Coordinates of C-alpha atoms in Angstrom, one line a residue:
Chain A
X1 CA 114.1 128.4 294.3
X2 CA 117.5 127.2 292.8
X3 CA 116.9 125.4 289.4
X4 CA 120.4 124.1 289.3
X5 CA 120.0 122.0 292.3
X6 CA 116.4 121.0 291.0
X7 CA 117.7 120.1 288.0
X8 CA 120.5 118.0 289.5
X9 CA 117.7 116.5 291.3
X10 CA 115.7 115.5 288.6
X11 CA 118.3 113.9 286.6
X12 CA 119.2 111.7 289.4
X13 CA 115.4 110.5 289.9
X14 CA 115.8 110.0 286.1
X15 CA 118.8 107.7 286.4
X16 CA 117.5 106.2 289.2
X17 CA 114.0 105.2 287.5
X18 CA 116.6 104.5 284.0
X19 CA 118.6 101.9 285.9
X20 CA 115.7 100.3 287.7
X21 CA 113.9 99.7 284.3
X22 CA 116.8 97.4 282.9
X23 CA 117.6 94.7 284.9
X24 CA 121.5 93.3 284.0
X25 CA 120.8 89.9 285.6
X26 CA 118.4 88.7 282.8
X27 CA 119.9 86.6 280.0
X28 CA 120.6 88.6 276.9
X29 CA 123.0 89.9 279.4
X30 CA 125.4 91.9 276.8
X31 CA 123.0 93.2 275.1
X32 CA 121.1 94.2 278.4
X33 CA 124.4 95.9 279.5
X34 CA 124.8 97.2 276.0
X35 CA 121.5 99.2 276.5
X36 CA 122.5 99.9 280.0
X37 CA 126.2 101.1 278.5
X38 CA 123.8 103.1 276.6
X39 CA 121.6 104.6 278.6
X40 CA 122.9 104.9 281.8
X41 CA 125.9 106.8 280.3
X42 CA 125.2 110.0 281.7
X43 CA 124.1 112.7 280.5
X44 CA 121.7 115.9 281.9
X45 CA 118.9 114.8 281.4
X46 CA 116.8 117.4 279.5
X47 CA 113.8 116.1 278.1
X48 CA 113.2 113.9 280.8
X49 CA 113.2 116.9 282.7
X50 CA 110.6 118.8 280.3
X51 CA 108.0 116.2 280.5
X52 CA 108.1 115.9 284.5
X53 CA 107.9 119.8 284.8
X54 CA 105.1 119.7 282.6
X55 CA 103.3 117.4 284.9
X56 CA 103.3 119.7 287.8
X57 CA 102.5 122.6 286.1
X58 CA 99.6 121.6 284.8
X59 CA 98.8 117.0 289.1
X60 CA 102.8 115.2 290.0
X61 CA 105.8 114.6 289.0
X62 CA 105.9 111.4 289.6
X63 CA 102.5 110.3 287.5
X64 CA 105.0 111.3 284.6
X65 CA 108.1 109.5 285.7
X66 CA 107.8 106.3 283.5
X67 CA 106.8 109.0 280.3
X68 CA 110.1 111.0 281.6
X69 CA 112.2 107.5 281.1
X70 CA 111.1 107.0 278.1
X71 CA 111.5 110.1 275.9
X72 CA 115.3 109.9 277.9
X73 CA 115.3 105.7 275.9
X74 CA 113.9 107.1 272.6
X75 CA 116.5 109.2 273.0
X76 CA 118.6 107.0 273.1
X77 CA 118.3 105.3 270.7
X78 CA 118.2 108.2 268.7
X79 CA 122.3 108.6 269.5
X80 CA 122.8 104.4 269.1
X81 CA 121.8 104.9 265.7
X82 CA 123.9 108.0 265.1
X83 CA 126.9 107.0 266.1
X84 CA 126.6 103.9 263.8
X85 CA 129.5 104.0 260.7
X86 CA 126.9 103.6 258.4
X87 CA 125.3 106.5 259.8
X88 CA 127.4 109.4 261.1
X89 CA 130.7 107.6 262.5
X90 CA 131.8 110.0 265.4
X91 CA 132.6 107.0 267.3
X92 CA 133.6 108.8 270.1
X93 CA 132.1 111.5 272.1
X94 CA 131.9 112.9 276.0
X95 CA 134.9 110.8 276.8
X96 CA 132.9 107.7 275.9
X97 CA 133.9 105.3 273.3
X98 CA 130.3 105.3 271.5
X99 CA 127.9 102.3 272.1
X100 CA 129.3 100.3 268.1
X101 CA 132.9 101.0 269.5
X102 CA 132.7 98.9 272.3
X103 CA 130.0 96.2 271.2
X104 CA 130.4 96.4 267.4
X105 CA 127.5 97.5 264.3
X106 CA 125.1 94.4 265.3
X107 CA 124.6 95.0 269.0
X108 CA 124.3 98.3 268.6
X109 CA 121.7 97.8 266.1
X110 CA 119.7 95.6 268.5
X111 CA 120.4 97.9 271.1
X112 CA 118.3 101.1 269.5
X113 CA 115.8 98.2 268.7
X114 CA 115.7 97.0 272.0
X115 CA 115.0 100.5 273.8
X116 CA 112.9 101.9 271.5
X117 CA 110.4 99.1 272.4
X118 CA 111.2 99.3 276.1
X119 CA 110.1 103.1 276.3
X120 CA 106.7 101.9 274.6
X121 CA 107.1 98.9 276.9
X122 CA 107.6 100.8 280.0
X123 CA 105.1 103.5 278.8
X124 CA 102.5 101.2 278.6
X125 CA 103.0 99.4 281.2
X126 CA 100.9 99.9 284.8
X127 CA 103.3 98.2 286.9
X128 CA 105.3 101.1 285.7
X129 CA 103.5 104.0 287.7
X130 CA 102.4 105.2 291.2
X131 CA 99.2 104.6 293.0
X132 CA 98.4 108.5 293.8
X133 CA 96.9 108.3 290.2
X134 CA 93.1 109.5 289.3
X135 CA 93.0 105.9 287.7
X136 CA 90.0 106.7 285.9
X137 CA 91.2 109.3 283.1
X138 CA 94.9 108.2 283.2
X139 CA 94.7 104.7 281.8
X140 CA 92.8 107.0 278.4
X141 CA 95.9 109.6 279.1
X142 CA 98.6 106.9 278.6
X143 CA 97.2 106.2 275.4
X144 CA 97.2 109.5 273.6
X145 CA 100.7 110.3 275.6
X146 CA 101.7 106.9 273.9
X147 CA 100.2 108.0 270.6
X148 CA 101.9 111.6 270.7
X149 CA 105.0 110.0 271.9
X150 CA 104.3 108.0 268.8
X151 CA 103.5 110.7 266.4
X152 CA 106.9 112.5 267.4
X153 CA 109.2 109.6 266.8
X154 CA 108.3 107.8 263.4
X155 CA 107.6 109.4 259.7
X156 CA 106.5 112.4 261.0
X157 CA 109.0 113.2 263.5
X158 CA 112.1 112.8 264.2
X159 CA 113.0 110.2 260.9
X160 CA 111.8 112.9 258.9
X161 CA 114.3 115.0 260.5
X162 CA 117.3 112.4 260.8
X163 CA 116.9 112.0 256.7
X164 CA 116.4 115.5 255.6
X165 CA 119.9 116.1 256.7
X166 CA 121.2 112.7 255.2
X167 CA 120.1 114.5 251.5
X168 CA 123.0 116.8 251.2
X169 CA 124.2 125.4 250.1
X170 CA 120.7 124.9 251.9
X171 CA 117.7 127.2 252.1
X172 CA 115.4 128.5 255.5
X173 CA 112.7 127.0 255.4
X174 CA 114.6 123.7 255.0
X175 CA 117.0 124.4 257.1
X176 CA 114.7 125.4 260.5
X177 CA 112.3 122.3 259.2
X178 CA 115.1 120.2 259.8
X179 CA 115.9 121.2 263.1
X180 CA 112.2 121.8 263.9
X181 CA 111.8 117.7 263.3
X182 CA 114.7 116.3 264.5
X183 CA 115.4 118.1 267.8
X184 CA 112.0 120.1 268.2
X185 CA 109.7 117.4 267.8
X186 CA 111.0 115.0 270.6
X187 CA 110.8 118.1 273.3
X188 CA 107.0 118.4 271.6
X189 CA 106.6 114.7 272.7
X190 CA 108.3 115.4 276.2
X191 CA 106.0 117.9 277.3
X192 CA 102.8 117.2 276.2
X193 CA 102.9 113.3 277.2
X194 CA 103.9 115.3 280.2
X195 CA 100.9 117.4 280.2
X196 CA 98.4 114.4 279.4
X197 CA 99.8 112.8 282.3
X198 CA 99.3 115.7 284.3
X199 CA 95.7 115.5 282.9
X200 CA 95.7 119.2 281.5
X201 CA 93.3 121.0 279.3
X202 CA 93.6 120.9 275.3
X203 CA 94.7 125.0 275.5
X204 CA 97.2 123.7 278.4
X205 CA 98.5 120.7 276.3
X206 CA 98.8 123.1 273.1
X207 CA 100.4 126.0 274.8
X208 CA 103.1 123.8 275.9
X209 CA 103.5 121.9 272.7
X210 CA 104.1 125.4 270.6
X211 CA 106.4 125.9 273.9
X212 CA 108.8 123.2 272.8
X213 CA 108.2 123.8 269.1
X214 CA 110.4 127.0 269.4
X215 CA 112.8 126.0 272.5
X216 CA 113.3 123.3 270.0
X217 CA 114.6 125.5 267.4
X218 CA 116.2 127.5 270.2
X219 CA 118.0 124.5 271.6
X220 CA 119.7 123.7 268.0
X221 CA 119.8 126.9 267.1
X222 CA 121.9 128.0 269.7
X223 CA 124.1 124.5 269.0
X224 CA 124.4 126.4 265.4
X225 CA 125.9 129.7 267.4
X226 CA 128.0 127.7 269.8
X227 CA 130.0 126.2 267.1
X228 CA 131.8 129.4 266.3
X229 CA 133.3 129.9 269.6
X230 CA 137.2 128.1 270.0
X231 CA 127.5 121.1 257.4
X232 CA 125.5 124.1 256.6
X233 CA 124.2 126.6 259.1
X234 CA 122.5 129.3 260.4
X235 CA 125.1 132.0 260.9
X236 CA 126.2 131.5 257.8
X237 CA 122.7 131.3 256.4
X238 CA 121.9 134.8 258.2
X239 CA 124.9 136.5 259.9
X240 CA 126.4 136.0 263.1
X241 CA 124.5 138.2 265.5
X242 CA 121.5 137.8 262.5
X243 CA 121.0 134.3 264.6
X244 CA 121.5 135.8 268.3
X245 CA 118.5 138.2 267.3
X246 CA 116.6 135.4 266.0
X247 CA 117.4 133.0 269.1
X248 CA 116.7 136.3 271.3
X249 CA 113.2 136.0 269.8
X250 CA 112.5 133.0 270.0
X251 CA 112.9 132.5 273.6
X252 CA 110.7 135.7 273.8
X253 CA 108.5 133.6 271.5
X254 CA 108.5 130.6 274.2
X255 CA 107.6 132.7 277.8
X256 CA 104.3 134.6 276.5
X257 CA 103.4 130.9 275.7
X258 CA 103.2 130.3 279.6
X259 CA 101.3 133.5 280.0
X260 CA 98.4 131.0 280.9
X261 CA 99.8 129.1 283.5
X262 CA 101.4 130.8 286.8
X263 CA 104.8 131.6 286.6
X264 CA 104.5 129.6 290.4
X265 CA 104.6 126.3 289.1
X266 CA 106.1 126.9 285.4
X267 CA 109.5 128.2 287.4
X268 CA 111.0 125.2 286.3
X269 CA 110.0 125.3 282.3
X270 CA 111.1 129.1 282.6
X271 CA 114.3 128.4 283.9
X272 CA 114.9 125.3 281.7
X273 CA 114.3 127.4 278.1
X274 CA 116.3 130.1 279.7
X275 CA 119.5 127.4 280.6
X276 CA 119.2 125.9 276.8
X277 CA 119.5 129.7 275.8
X278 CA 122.7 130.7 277.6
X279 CA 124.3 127.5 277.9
X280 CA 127.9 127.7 277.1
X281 CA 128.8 124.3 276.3
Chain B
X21 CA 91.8 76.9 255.2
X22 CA 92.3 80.3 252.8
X23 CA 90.1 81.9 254.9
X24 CA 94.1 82.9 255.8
X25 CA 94.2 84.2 252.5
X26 CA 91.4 86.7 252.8
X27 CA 93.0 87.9 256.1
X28 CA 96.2 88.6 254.5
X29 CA 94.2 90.3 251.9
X30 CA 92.4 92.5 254.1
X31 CA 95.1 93.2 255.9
X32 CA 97.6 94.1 253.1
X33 CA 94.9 96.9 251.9
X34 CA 94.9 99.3 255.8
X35 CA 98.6 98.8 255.0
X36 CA 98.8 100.5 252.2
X37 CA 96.7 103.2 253.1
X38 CA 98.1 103.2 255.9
X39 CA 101.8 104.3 254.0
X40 CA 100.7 106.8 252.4
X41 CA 103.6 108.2 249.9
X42 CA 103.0 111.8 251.6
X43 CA 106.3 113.4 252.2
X44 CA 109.3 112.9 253.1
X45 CA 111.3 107.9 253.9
X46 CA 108.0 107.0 253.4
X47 CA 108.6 105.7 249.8
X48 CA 111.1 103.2 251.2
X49 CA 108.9 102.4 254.7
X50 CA 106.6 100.4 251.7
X51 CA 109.1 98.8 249.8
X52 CA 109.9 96.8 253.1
X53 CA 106.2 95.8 253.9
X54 CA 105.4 94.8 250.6
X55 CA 108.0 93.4 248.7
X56 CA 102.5 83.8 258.0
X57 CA 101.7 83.4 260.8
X58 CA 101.9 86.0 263.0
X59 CA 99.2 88.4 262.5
X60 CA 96.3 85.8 261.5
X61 CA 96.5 83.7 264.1
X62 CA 95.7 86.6 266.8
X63 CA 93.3 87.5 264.1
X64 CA 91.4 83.8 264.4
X65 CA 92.4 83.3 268.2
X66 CA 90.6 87.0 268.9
X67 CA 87.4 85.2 266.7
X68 CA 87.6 83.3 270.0
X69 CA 85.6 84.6 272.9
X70 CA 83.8 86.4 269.8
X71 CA 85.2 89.4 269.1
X72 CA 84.1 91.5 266.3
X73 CA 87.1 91.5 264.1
X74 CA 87.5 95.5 263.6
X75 CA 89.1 95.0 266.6
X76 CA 91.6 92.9 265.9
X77 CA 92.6 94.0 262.6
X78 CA 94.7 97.1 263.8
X79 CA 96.9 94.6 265.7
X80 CA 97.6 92.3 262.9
X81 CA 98.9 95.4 260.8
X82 CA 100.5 96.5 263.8
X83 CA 102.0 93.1 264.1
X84 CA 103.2 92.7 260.2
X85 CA 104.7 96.2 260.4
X86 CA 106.8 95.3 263.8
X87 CA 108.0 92.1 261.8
X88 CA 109.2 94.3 259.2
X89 CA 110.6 96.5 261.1
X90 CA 113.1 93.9 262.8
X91 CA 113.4 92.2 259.5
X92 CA 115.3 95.5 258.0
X93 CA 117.5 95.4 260.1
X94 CA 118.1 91.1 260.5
X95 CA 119.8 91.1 256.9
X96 CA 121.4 94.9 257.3
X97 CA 125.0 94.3 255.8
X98 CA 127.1 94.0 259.3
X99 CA 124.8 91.2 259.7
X100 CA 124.6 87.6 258.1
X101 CA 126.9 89.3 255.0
X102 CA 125.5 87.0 252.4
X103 CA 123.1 86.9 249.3
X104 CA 116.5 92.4 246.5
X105 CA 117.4 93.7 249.6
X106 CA 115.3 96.2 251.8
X107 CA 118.6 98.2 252.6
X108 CA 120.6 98.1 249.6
X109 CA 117.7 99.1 247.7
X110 CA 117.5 102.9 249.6
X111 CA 121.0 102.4 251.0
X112 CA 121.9 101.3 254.5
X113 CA 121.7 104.4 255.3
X114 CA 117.5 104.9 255.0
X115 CA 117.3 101.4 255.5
X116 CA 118.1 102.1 259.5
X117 CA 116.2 105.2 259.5
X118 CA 112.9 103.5 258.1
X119 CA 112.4 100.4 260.4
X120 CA 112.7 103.1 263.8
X121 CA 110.0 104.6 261.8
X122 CA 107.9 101.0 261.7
X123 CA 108.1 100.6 265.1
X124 CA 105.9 103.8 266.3
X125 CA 104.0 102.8 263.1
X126 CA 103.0 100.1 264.8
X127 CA 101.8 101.9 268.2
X128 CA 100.3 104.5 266.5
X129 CA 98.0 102.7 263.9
X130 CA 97.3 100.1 266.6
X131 CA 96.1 103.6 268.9
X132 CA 94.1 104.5 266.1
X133 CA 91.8 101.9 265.5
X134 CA 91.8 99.1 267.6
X135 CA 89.1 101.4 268.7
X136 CA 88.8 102.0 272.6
X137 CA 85.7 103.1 273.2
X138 CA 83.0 100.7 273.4
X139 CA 85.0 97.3 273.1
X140 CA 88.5 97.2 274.1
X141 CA 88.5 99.5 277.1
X142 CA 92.0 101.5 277.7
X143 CA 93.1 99.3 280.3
X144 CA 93.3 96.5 277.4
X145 CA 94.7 98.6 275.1
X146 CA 97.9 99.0 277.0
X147 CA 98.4 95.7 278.3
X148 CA 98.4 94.5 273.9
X149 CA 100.6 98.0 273.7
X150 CA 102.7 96.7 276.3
X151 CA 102.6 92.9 274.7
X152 CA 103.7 94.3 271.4
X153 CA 106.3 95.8 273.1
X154 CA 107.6 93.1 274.7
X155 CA 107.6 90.6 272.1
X156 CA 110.0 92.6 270.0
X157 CA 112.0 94.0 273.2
X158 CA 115.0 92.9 275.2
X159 CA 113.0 90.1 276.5
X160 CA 112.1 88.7 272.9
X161 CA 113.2 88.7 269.6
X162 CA 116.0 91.1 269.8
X163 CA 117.5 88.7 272.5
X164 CA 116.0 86.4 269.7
X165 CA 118.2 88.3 266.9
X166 CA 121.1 88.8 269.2
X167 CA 121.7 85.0 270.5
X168 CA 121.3 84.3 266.5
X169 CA 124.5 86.0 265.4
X170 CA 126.2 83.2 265.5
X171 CA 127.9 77.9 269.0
X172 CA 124.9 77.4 266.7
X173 CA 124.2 73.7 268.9
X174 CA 122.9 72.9 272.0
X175 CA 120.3 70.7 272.8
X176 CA 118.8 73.2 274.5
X177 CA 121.2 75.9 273.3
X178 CA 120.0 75.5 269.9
X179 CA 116.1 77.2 271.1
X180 CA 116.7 80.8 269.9
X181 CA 114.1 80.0 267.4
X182 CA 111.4 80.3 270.8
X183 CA 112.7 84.4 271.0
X184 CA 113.0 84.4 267.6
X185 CA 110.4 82.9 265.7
X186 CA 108.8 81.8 268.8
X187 CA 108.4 85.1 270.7
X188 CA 106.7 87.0 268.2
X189 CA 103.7 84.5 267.9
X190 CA 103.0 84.4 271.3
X191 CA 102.3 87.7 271.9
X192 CA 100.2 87.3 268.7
X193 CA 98.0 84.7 270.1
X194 CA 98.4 86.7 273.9
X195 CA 97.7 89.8 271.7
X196 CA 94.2 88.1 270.3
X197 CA 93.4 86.4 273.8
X198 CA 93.2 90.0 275.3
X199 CA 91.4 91.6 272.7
X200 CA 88.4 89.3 272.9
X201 CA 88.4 89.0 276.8
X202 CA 90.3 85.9 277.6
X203 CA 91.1 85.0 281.2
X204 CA 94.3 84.8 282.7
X205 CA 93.9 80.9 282.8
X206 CA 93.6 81.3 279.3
X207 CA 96.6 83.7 278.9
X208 CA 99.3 81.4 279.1
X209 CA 97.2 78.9 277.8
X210 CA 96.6 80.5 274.5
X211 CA 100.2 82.2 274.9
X212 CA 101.7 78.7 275.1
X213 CA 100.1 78.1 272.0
X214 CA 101.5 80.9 270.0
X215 CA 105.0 80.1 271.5
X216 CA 105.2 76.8 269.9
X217 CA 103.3 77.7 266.9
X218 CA 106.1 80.0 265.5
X219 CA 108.5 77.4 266.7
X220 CA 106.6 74.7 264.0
X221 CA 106.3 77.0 261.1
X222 CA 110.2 77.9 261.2
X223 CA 111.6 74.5 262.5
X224 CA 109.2 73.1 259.8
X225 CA 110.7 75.4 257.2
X226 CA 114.0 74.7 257.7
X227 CA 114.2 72.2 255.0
X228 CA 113.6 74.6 252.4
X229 CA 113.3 78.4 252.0
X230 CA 110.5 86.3 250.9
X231 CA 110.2 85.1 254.8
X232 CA 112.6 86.4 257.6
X233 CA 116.4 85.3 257.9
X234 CA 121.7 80.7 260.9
X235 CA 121.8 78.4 264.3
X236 CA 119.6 76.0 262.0
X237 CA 117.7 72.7 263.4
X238 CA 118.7 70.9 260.7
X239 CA 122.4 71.1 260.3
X240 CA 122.9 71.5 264.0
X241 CA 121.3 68.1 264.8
X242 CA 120.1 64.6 263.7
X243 CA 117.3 65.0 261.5
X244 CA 115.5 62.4 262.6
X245 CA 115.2 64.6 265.6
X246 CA 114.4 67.4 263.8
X247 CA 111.5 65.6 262.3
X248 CA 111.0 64.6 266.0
X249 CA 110.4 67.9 267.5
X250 CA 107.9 68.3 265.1
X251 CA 105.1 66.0 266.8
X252 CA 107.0 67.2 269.7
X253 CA 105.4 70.9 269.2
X254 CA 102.5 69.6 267.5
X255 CA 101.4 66.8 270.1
X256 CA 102.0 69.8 272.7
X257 CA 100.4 73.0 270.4
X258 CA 97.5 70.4 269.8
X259 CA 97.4 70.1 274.0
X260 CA 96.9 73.6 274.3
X261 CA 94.4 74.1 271.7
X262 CA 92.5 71.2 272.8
X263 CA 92.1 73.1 276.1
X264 CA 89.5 75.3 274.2
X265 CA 85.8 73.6 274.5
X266 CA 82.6 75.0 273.2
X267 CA 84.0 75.3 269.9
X268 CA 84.5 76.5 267.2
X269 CA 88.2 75.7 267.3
X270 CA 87.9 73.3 264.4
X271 CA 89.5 76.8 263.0
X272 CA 92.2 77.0 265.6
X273 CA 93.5 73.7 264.8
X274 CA 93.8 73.8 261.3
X275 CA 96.6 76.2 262.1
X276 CA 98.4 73.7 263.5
X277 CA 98.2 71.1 260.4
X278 CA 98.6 74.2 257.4
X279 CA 102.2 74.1 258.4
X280 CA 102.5 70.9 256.8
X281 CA 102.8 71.7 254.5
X282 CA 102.5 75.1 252.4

């Protein structure tokens, strides 16, 4: 096993699957390139990743594939919206000119709008997955991995998260509920759509949604770390090394979570929460 | 008949509880779905093939909330820029924010009743997920939005009003036809129908207009053609509906004649 290559892998079945969904023939042709320009730009592809790992570990990767596209549009449009002037400006980031520089506020509006429905689209959608699927449980499955994608994304979710921070010296428990509902909750969605997909138990489904919960917080938290090398935060909030000990743990936190499955399969999640850890971007 | 009013009633009370104020967002989600003819008509055209209702009323609040949620965001400032408003009331800002929130509002209350078991098996329930969808993705109504930002005529340029105003009806008839078991030669059929049904009340409308917000029949072209696509979408609405035997339909007609006038 080399999880680099898998996940270079991955990420290309991702893009591949990503560009397929969208095709740039059909009439609204800018804005279908604007969501193309969008979503096609790149990228590692991380929560698709989660979700299709959490299909095999619990049935295969490919049952989850149209799920994996879609948490990788919601996303999307979840950085669309961000990079809006109204929003957050940052217009420009990677080496991309973000999606309101090149097709102005409007389009990029539409754009979130249009993707957004497209992962629910596509989600829904039968023409949308393989035939090597139990078709008797999974149409029920696509539902409730619709409705937990749903649960993650609106009031309860991420919004709550994006707004929290739009309030504006902030305290803990604010702080890590922040984070916990803007970044945690869409890896929530990611895996467990991915483990109703795979068809797993409730303890299965649950073990790997309190998995995400705290690689969530790990992911962001580690972002907060990050910043210091070459908005309020959590090394300020704690110390410096006060919030290596608590990412330390919370990794920690994440592994005895897959205690029930066999370390076998779950080699991917493993290595994934162990790359968000270290990652020296 | 106001049998439309006691449908919007109805539906206006699983709204509300279905905003609750619980914390955070939420208060501003409200003001923008409480501040025709969308979700009654897939209310009435699921009566068809004799549904019970229960069933059908998740997807009219489903379909109210999506219309809100697009509507935020069709008179957001870098819009139409021109004269209270859903956004500057909580500030562009939220504004955004709350319609992404409608949207899996929408998927989730529809999930939640809209019940599956017993009538409505799974299978269904995707397809209206993946109508719903549709209707307000690239396909329709954002394409809608999108060709309407400014040109304005064509003689068959000037039909952004069938992605529109048009595209959001027809899955609202297609939404009620699958509800209650119609057949595919009844999906287009009943589909058609809802196409140029949001065509009428909007083409009808624009000759005075608190509704949803350019590229106008009117102004772009002779009037008396404007008036003329009028039996032009009624003569062909009527054709569709008329396909339906074994009524009653009496009440999917009426529909057709409300819109003139209100």
């Amino acid at each position: 096993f080399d999880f680099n290559a898998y996940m270079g892998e991955k990420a290309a079945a991702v893009n591949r699957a990503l560009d397929a969904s969208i095709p740039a023939d059909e009439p609204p042709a800018a804005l279908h390139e604007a969501m193309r320009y969008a979503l096609l730009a790149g990228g590692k592809r991380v929560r698709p990743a989660l979700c299709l790992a959490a299909c095999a570990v619990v049935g295969r990767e490919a049952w989850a594939m149209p799920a994996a596209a879609a948490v990788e549009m919601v996303h999307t449009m979840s950085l669309v919206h961000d990079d809006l002037p109204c929003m957050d400006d940052d217009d420009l980031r990677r080496g991309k000119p973000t999606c309101h520089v090149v097709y102005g506020e409007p389009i990029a509006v539409l754009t979130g709008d249009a993707l957004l429905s497209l992962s629910f689209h596509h989600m829904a959608r039968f023409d949308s997955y393989p035939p090597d699927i139990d078709a008797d449980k999974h149409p029920a499955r696509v539902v409730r991995a619709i409705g937990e994608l749903a649960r993650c994304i609106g009031s309860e979710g991420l919004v709550a998260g994006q707004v929290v921070d739009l309030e504006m010296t902030v305290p803990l428990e604010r702080l890590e509920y922040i984070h916990l509902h803007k970044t945690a909750a869409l890896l929530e969605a990611s895996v467990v759509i991915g483990a109703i997909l795979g068809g797993g138990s409730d303890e299965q489904i649950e073990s790997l949604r309190m998995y995400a919960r705290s690689i969530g917080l790990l992911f962001q938290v580690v972002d907060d770390i990050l910043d210091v090398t070459k908005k309020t935060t959590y090394p300020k909030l704690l110390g410096l090394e006060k919030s290596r000990e608590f990412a330390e743990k919370l990794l920690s936190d994440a592994r005895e979570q897959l205690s029930g499955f066999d370390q076998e399969t779950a080699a991917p999640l493993l290595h994934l929460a162990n790359y968000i850890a270290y990652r020296q971007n | 008949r106001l049998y439309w009013t006691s449908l919007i009633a109805d539906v206006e009370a699983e709204l509300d509880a279905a905003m609750p104020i619980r914390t955070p967002i939420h208060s501003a989600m409200r003001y923008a779905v409480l501040p025709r003819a969308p979700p009654v008509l897939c209310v009435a055209a699921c009566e068809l093939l004799g549904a019970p209702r229960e069933a059908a009323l998740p997807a009219a609040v489903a379909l109210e909330m999506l219309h809100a949620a697009s509507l935020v965001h069709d008179d957001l400032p870098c819009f139409d820029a021109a004269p209270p408003s859903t956004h500057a009331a909580y500030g562009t800002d939220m504004a955004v924010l709350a319609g992404d929130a409608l949207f899996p509002l929408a998927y989730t209350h529809v999930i939640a009743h809209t019940p599956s078991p017993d009538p409505v098996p799974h299978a269904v329930l995707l397809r209206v997920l993946g109508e719903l969808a549709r209707a307000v993705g690239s396909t329709g109504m954002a394409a809608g939005q999108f060709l309407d930002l400014a040109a304005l005529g064509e003689a068959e340029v000037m039909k952004v009003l069938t992605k529109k105003f048009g595209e959001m009806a027809e899955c609202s008839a297609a939404c009620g036809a699958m509800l209650g078991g119609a057949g595919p030669d009844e999906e287009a059929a009943l589909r058609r129908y809802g196409r140029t049904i949001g065509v009428l009340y909007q083409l009808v409308d624009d000759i005075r207009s608190n509704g949803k917000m350019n590229a106008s029949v009117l102004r772009a072209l002779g009037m008396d053609r404007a008036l003329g696509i009028v039996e032009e979408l009624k003569a062909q609405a009527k054709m569709e509906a008329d396909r339906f035997g074994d009524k009653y339909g009496e009440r999917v007609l009426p529909l057709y004649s409300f819109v003139d006038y209100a």
